[PDB]
Amino acid sequence: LASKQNRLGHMQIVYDEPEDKKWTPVHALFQICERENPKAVAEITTEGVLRDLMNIARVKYRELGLCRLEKAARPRASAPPIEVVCDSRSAVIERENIMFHPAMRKALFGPTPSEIKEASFGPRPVTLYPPRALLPAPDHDKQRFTNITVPSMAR
Amino acid sequence: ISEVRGNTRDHRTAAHTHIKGLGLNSSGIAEKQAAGFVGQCAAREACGVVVDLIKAHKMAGRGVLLAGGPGTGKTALALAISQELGTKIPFCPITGSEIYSTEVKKTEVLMENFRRAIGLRVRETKDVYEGEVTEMTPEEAENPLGGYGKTISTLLIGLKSARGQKKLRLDPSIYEAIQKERVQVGDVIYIETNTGACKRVGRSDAYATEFDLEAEEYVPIPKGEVHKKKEIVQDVTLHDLDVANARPQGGQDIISMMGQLMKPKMTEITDKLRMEINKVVQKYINQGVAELIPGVLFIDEAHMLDIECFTYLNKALESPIAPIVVLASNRGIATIRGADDLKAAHGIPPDFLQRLLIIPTHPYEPDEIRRIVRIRAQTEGVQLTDAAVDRVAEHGVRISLRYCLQLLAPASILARVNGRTQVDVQDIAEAEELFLDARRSANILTSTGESGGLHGFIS
Amino acid sequence: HRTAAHTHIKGLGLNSSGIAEKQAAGFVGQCAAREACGVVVDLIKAHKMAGRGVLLAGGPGTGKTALALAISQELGTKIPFCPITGSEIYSTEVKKTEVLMENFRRAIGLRVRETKDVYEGEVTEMTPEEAENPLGGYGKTISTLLIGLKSARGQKKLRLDPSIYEAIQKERVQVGDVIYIETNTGACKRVGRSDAYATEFDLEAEEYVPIPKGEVHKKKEIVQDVTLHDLDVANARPQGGQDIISMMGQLMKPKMTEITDKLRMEINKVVQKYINQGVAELIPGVLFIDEAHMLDIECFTYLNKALESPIAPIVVLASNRGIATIRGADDLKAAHGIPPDFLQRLLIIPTHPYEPDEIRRIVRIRAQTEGVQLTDAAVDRVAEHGVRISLRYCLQLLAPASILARVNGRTQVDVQDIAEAEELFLDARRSANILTSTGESGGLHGFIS
Amino acid sequence: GLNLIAAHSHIRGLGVDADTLEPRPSSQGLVGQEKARKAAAVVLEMIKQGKIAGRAVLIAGPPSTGKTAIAMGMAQSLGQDVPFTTLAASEIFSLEMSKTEALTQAFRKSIGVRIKEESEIMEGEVVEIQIDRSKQGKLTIKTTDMEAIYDMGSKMIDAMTKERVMAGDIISIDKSSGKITKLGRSYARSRDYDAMGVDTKFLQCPEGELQKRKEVVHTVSLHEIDVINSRTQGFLALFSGDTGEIRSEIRDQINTKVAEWKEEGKAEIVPGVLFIDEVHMLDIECFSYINRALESDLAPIVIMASNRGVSRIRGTDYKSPHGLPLDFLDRVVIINTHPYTPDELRQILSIRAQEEEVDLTPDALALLTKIGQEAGLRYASNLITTSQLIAAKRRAKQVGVEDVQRSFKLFYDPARSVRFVQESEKRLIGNDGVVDF
Amino acid sequence: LIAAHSHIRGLGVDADTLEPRPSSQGLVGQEKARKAAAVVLEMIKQGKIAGRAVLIAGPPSTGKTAIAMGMAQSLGQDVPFTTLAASEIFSLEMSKTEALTQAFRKSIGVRIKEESEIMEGEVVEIQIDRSVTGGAKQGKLTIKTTDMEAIYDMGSKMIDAMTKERVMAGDIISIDKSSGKITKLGRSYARSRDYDAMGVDTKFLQCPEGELQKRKEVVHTVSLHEIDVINSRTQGFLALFSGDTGEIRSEIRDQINTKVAEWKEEGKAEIVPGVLFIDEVHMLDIECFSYINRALESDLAPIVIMASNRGVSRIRGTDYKSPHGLPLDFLDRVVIINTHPYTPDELRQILSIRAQEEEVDLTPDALALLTKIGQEAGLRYASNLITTSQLIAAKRRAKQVGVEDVQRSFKLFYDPARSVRFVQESEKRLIGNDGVVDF
Ligand SMILES: Nc1ncnc2c1ncn2[C@@H]1O[C@H](COP(=O)(O)OP(=O)(O)O)[C@@H](O)[C@H]1O
Ligand SMILES: Nc1ncnc2c1ncn2[C@@H]1O[C@H](COP(=O)(O)OP(=O)(O)O)[C@@H](O)[C@H]1O
Ligand SMILES: Nc1ncnc2c1ncn2[C@@H]1O[C@H](COP(=O)(O)OP(=O)(O)O)[C@@H](O)[C@H]1O
Numbered sequence A: 001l002a003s004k005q006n007r008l009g010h011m012q013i014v015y016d017e018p019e020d021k022k023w024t025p026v027h028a029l030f031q032i033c034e035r036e037n038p039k040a041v042a043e044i045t046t047e048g049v050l051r052d053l054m055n056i057a058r059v060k061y062r063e064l065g066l067c068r069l070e071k072a073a074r075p076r077a078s079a080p081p082i083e084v085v086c087d088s089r090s091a092v093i094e095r096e097n098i099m100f101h102p103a104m105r106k107a108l109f110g111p112t113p114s115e116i117k118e119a120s121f122g123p124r125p126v127t128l129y130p131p132r133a134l135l136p137a138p139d140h141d142k143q144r145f146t147n148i149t150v151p152s153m154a155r
Numbered sequence B: 001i002s003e004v005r006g007n008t009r010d011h012r013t014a015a016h017t018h019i020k021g022l023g024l025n026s027s028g029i030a031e032k033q034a035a036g037f038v039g040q041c042a043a044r045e046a047c048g049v050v051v052d053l054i055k056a057h058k059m060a061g062r063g064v065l066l067a068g069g070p071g072t073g074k075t076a077l078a079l080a081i082s083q084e085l086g087t088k089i090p091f092c093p094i095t096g097s098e099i100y101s102t103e104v105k106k107t108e109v110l111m112e113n114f115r116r117a118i119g120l121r122v123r124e125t126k127d128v129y130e131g132e133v134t135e136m137t138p139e140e141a142e143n144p145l146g147g148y149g150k151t152i153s154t155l156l157i158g159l160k161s162a163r164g165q166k167k168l169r170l171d172p173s174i175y176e177a178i179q180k181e182r183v184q185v186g187d188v189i190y191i192e193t194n195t196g197a198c199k200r201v202g203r204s205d206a207y208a209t210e211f212d213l214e215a216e217e218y219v220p221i222p223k224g225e226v227h228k229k230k231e232i233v234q235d236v237t238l239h240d241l242d243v244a245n246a247r248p249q250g251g252q253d254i255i256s257m258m259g260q261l262m263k264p265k266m267t268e269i270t271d272k273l274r275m276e277i278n279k280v281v282q283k284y285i286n287q288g289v290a291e292l293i294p295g296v297l298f299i300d301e302a303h304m305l306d307i308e309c310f311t312y313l314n315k316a317l318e319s320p321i322a323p324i325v326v327l328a329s330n331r332g333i334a335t336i337r338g339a340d341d342l343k344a345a346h347g348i349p350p351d352f353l354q355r356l357l358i359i360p361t362h363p364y365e366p367d368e369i370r371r372i373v374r375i376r377a378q379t380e381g382v383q384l385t386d387a388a389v390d391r392v393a394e395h396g397v398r399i400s401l402r403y404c405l406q407l408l409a410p411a412s413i414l415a416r417v418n419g420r421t422q423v424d425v426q427d428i429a430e431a432e433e434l435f436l437d438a439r440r441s442a443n444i445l446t447s448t449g450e451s452g453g454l455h456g457f458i459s
Numbered sequence C: 001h002r003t004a005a006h007t008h009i010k011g012l013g014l015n016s017s018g019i020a021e022k023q024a025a026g027f028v029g030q031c032a033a034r035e036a037c038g039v040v041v042d043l044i045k046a047h048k049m050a051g052r053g054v055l056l057a058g059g060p061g062t063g064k065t066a067l068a069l070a071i072s073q074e075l076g077t078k079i080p081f082c083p084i085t086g087s088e089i090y091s092t093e094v095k096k097t098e099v100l101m102e103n104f105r106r107a108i109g110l111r112v113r114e115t116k117d118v119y120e121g122e123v124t125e126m127t128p129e130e131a132e133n134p135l136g137g138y139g140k141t142i143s144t145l146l147i148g149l150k151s152a153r154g155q156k157k158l159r160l161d162p163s164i165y166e167a168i169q170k171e172r173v174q175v176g177d178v179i180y181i182e183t184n185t186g187a188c189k190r191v192g193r194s195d196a197y198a199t200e201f202d203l204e205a206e207e208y209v210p211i212p213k214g215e216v217h218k219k220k221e222i223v224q225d226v227t228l229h230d231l232d233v234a235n236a237r238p239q240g241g242q243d244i245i246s247m248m249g250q251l252m253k254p255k256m257t258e259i260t261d262k263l264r265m266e267i268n269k270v271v272q273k274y275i276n277q278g279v280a281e282l283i284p285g286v287l288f289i290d291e292a293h294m295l296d297i298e299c300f301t302y303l304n305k306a307l308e309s310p311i312a313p314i315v316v317l318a319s320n321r322g323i324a325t326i327r328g329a330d331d332l333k334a335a336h337g338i339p340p341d342f343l344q345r346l347l348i349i350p351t352h353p354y355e356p357d358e359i360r361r362i363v364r365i366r367a368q369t370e371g372v373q374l375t376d377a378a379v380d381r382v383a384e385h386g387v388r389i390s391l392r393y394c395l396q397l398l399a400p401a402s403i404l405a406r407v408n409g410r411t412q413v414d415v416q417d418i419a420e421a422e423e424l425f426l427d428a429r430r431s432a433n434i435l436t437s438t439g440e441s442g443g444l445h446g447f448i449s
Numbered sequence D: 001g002l003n004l005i006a007a008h009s010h011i012r013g014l015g016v017d018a019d020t021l022e023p024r025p026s027s028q029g030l031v032g033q034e035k036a037r038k039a040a041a042v043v044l045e046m047i048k049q050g051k052i053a054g055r056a057v058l059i060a061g062p063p064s065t066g067k068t069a070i071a072m073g074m075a076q077s078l079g080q081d082v083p084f085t086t087l088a089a090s091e092i093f094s095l096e097m098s099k100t101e102a103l104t105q106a107f108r109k110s111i112g113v114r115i116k117e118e119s120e121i122m123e124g125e126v127v128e129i130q131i132d133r134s135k136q137g138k139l140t141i142k143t144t145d146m147e148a149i150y151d152m153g154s155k156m157i158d159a160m161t162k163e164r165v166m167a168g169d170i171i172s173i174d175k176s177s178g179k180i181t182k183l184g185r186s187y188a189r190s191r192d193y194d195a196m197g198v199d200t201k202f203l204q205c206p207e208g209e210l211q212k213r214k215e216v217v218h219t220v221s222l223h224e225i226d227v228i229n230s231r232t233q234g235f236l237a238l239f240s241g242d243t244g245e246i247r248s249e250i251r252d253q254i255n256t257k258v259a260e261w262k263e264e265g266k267a268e269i270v271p272g273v274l275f276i277d278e279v280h281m282l283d284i285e286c287f288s289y290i291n292r293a294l295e296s297d298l299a300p301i302v303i304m305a306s307n308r309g310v311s312r313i314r315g316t317d318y319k320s321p322h323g324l325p326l327d328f329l330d331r332v333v334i335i336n337t338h339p340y341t342p343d344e345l346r347q348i349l350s351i352r353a354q355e356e357e358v359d360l361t362p363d364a365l366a367l368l369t370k371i372g373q374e375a376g377l378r379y380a381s382n383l384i385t386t387s388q389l390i391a392a393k394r395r396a397k398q399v400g401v402e403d404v405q406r407s408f409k410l411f412y413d414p415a416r417s418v419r420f421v422q423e424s425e426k427r428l429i430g431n432d433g434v435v436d437f
Numbered sequence E: 001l002i003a004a005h006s007h008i009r010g011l012g013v014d015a016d017t018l019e020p021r022p023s024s025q026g027l028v029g030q031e032k033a034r035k036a037a038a039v040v041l042e043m044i045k046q047g048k049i050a051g052r053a054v055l056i057a058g059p060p061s062t063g064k065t066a067i068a069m070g071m072a073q074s075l076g077q078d079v080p081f082t083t084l085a086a087s088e089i090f091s092l093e094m095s096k097t098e099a100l101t102q103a104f105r106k107s108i109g110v111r112i113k114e115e116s117e118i119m120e121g122e123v124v125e126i127q128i129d130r131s132v133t134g135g136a137k138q139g140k141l142t143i144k145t146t147d148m149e150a151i152y153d154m155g156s157k158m159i160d161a162m163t164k165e166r167v168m169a170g171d172i173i174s175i176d177k178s179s180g181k182i183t184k185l186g187r188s189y190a191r192s193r194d195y196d197a198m199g200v201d202t203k204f205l206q207c208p209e210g211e212l213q214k215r216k217e218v219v220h221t222v223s224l225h226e227i228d229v230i231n232s233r234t235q236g237f238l239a240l241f242s243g244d245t246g247e248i249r250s251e252i253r254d255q256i257n258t259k260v261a262e263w264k265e266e267g268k269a270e271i272v273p274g275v276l277f278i279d280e281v282h283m284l285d286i287e288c289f290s291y292i293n294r295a296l297e298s299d300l301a302p303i304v305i306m307a308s309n310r311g312v313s314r315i316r317g318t319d320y321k322s323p324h325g326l327p328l329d330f331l332d333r334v335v336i337i338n339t340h341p342y343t344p345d346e347l348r349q350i351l352s353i354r355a356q357e358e359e360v361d362l363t364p365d366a367l368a369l370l371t372k373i374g375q376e377a378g379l380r381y382a383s384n385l386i387t388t389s390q391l392i393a394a395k396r397r398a399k400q401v402g403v404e405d406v407q408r409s410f411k412l413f414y415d416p417a418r419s420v421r422f423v424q425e426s427e428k429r430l431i432g433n434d435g436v437v438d439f
């Protein structure tokens, strides 16, 4: 899904005439909820009076300073996941193909810079299997995805 | 592709098809046999006062009860109010046995139905460049930057709609759209105004045969303008705002692309979110952009709500932004479902009942059932003689109202099978023994069904 | 600085010979309960305990939980004390016996020394070195790096795994960012731009810190206070390391799960391995279950096997019930709500009601604790209300009577202020009398019966 | 072949005259229930007309009289055009979706949307991929009759690259959408490789013209449209079951667009039949929703069955006729049934004989008629198979009096099992105590 | 709009003596309970005394929620005031006790103060370097006030905000350096005549004076529940809005209480204690009271004010009765304030206030008849008659309402005292606990 350009939202922007009798492609006929969506009309408007309603949760979450606030609690213990001590080579290969599984890591973090070079100096446009970095943006700026904090020049 | 059938575009007959409105005067006094109703004067006058209260925008959390026995016209008055208000004012007809969920608490589906019952009308503008791309021709700058190659100051795009074409000069930072979206000659795009980043809709239909096999969607030319400056009215219910702020629709990561990929779960909504949305909607009303329009939450069968729900309804009706709550109860002295202690009137607790404008509903006279039969018969199209009307009215007075409105379809079928066009006394006297009522069924059940044996029922 | 209901209690107030001296350190009287609580406290602080039952009987308003706060302030800060209720364990994710065992292992603490191995440097050259990647769908994969860390005294130029590179990469470490690679998990927190790249013309609002002094490969020891339930949660839902289970396991929502018997035994063996290395010290504690009669019979069944463990904290139950019916099975009545089989484990401590002078002393202590000074006739009036109505009703007539005193320009509280606050604010008994008298018939001016 | 002789196998339609609605007795399996079958014929003739929306037809009567038989006769005598839905009432009480929504989906299944279109598809076996690294290319495809060379421009070469199409595959292109669907490989290249992979399935070559266009009549239900528009890749949810409380705004948009399709002539709405078997298992929390869902325009003609007499309603504590609340029985119409005469029992056992290809002597048929009169239909119909099998053990062609008496001696009818229970009470666990001799 | 508690503008007592005025600020007609609620309000505004319980008992339609909204309007938008109803606690997601714990911890505000750094001035040039097919971005921003001429740098988030805002040359923007938001204030030049998709000509502002890097000290108030949710989850933020918080373990609360105490001592934060209002507490069962009695034992408990309606009722989840439906081990802790039914000379002025709020003009004969109706059917029928008589007078085109309009509204809409008789007359065409007939 991460490399599928949505287009049925845009039909509501372009094909928006009373004469045009609400044209939809026949091979996308039953996707009705994909087609009539107020978000797609909302992202186009001159005044953002509906865009300032559709994501007011993020605006209130930012204006309360719930990102810059120092993280008060943290878990008292952490651990790696339990592994199997089985003394064959196949167990080690299955561990390094499931618990690490480089397809998901490549799909999550992004492309190798060598792959960026061979995709951006080529004669023709080519796609990338992680088309962008699919890691989600962390929702706490000062302390992201770890638990390792330090004293604060404030204190 | 899809082949259009040239048949008759009729409609289907429901139980409330003939209702077309209240049928009042210009002074509010009801008039009998008008717009579907027969009689029921005071209830239609009171519902006209309710309709006037709704369209006057003075209702801010009232509550209206519809008493009266079963089969007397409460849902008929509800659909009359919903067709009297129109379409541009919301109407959410939930039942009592629809708040019981298995994902959320049952005092939350009520609040989501309140938010479904409130509408918000927003008037805005839409400024887009539109159509199929003909040229993408750059223009060299007057002073190129030293150390680089090309230096392009204005990018030209020729957009051709289905009415007229137009050349367009643009800022050069449209290139990041065009490389990322792969826009070429013969692809319809739209360019917005607030940001200005074109997004391809598809290959046009005129270039649907330059190749043979390489196919995608072949969208037609935009049959409209090339410079839309069109204004839009847009109706969003506050339920939609609650959902779009709680669960965001479109994100770009893994876990929100699993959230829309896994099943959407109803989740309970914290009250700070609703308070914030009310505080901002009441600000955009004061700016003079959005109009608030309250609607009707017709909670049918209000005796199925237990005592844990009316407690939440007291809080929800004391909110400053709330629709009207038209209940519908058809019980006398009943035990409330939650607390099996107090026998209260209508299934409503005595604390909640004081909020309610109680509208009665009376039984029908034995010379009005035949007028309802005539209106229902000319609604379905089933025509019939006057002695047949008198026999159906006899069955209507002596048995039930809903039963004499259901001896019209098998009588019509047996009529046009026997070889006639109108229904006589013989067809109804034959169809009265193929479709027994509840009374003769209970008579067979008690008399013939003596006890549990071989050829007997299972008590 | 907020006077709660339990602020004057500062301990049991015991002598050197373990004899309770009355009117000392907050309490008034209550000898036979405070001596037994002192015995319980020294049973806790001797570590010959693997599950003992201590019941605190007595009617409501007699100070059952005042003894509990006295115990919790007599043990100290460094001994675990888990107070819960009987209504807290009815959850919706797990069975309630799981919540019982999670509280039992909240009530056992451990003090562990750890040796963290930080690499605290300033990143000089960051260059990836990918390996061979044949046709397998995913494409190239970075497998080796050459990050050069530059501390104040002696730089170092080290080589990394793919996983620690992904730990770097999810931190957005550019060239110049000081970091501290933690070679226990693999985590690495960016601290800020080094001050060699300092510029006041900046916009990112970065935190400029100087170059970390000392060796780039430091090694530091710390002391940590970890309960066994923390280890249970750590090994149950993993959130440490740089693999996929421990990374996609911190983006989901956290759910309480059922930590089984095998994990609770394996963590016991791991902790015994820590103790045998002379590192960790075990300190058992108290589970204070207030309102134990709300627990049903399915919980008193499981407390038997939970107390038969070789490691189990001491349980202190509170129950203000007489002959009552157990919540689970409604056909056997017993004392306190405790079943007659579970009651034999318990060392039952009684608690007796008060006296018309002990109420006067408690009123005086509570008044000089909240900060409300008053006269002796007013103290006698409040003690009269304490004898007639209730104990914890007459304590609550001091907070309005201060405010009303400050209405009339006074400082001390006289008889008139309490004589007005006894009319504005009512108790439960006279309110029920007004209820029964005035609420004669249901109707418009009646009550919903 | 996944089709074995059940109880409802001889009923090939309702079996009435289509002109004057006269239920002739022995036609299409059903035997001698003339008034109820006439009433079901009137119901079926107002179903196929499809104008009158949302009735409710209860079929009362004693057990072993034919209430599900008439329902299966109405199901067989509609065809595949008008839908039908066999839902017993205990299916509603779920743990993932509530009772209201799992009963709304029973109404949303029984209304079809019918749409006719032209499918412009292209079958073909790949012969040679010719890519001109200059963008352009040529594809050579063949069938059993033809062979052609089609040009390709830029991007479906990349679609071939993403699909990894080798020479010998069976590709299919929907030219109205343009996406390659590799169907597998051909039997003409099974001789080529030796150790095949996992994904490869072998197929015959396509036959006939490459460009196949055909007018096909699609018929979906409203429940299909509701579940597909639930989530993003939600089409597999209706096979899996991984759906829950669908919101009302989606169903409102879908009903509005189905009305819009009926206006523009794209779609034809075909109302169908919901069959709620054993309706007395529903509690009052379900009848309070059925009394409202029979009001909309999009409501199927509900046919429901029942057994019980004056019984309690589940969920409440007051007796009522047929196990149904009276505010619901004021709304429905009731077709009573009747027990069977022996003259009908004999030929019903004859039809059950000729369905199971078991030959019976007339004396055995008369004895089995007497057993069916003394015990019921469901026990008499279960003795044909047993007598045939006991005749097969002693190697006799025709069953006789001896085999039917043997089958009556071995297996007990439910009339004698009650006397067996009440005869020996001290050993069966009644409610408290067992003797154990 | 005009809800059922929009005329109330506070509690209406004195500031020096707190004597109950007989007619002041909407709450007109009662003296004892308003004076006692003024005392409760004063000990909430003191903020020192923690963990009390106030039970506003009395007959229905006597203004209990009116006194609660009077205290709510009297605290202003500073102190938290949770309007919890007692049926919201019975969730299916989380447990019944943890919903109470969240309801207590939503009513303890923490007021922190932090310094942000805001910019101001006219943008002179934008310089954005972008990669091809995924990659980092580079940014140089030259900005000029009337005095300074700075060339700042940018990161990835600043460019993602600039392109979202479409900041061209010649805009008066103000960038918060800490949070990172961009608010265009207007322009100083005019719109160019060279490009088409430019936009809308904004407000004409001049070049701002002063300095670039200005500092600002903002005040942010979060409840303890928001701190619990943002410190209980690694990435799953925003679940404090969409209610997706399953369970917060006790190890998180016992750390956040200690850190809030440390923030209180350092002068970083200030604890503002609040009010938890529980409307109609008689619906809670005994499993809730066995936790409510013990959550009022710590320094972080809010002063609970709660209402009731019932006489000797049976407590849910049990088998026995009690006054107000509350257990007698919980009624020792509480303090009960009684309310009395009204007198007609007070109902007259209450209906006068409700009529002047909904913009309805009356005649004194209609007001006398309305008071006569309100004696027998309460305020809840009389206010509905006020609004209904307004619209019926609007239908027949009359200026002021009259006796005939009130009689019309009394004829159309029954009070409950006549609907009870309407039930008791026709008992054969209403579904009781038994069957029903049809004529
Ligand atoms: N005044 C009326 N005029 C015409 N038809 C009526 C009238 N009142 C009721 N009906 C018919 O009676 C039928 C049953 O009434 P219904 O609305 O089901 O009663 P209830 O509201 O108690 O459920 C409806 O189909 C409606 O068409
Ligand atoms: N010995 C005592 N000295 C001082 N105060 C006491 C004493 N015993 C009880 N109290 C008071 O009684 C009040 C309630 O005691 P508590 O332990 O809550 O009663 P219960 O035993 O019913 O839980 C507390 O506020 C406490 O101040
Ligand atoms: N008229 C009939 N002709 C032939 N077989 C019948 C007839 N009526 C019923 N049966 C058979 O009797 C059996 C019982 O009918 P069914 O509807 O299942 O009874 P019930 O209503 O008790 O479920 C069915 O298997 C059916 O095949």
Ligand SMILES: Nc1ncnc2c1ncn2[C@@H]1O[C@H](COP(=O)(O)OP(=O)(O)O)[C@@H](O)[C@H]1O
Pocket (backbone or CB within 6 Å): E004, E005, E026, E027, E028, E029, E030, E059, E060, E061, E062, E063, E064, E065, E066, E067, E350, E379, E380
């Ligand atoms: N003393 C009063 N002052 C102003 N309005 C009042 C007063 N008493 C009652 N009301 C009005 O009467 C209505 C009922 O009061 P409310 O507190 O909702 O009753 P209850 O306590 O039974 O819920 C409220 O809308 C309020 O506006």
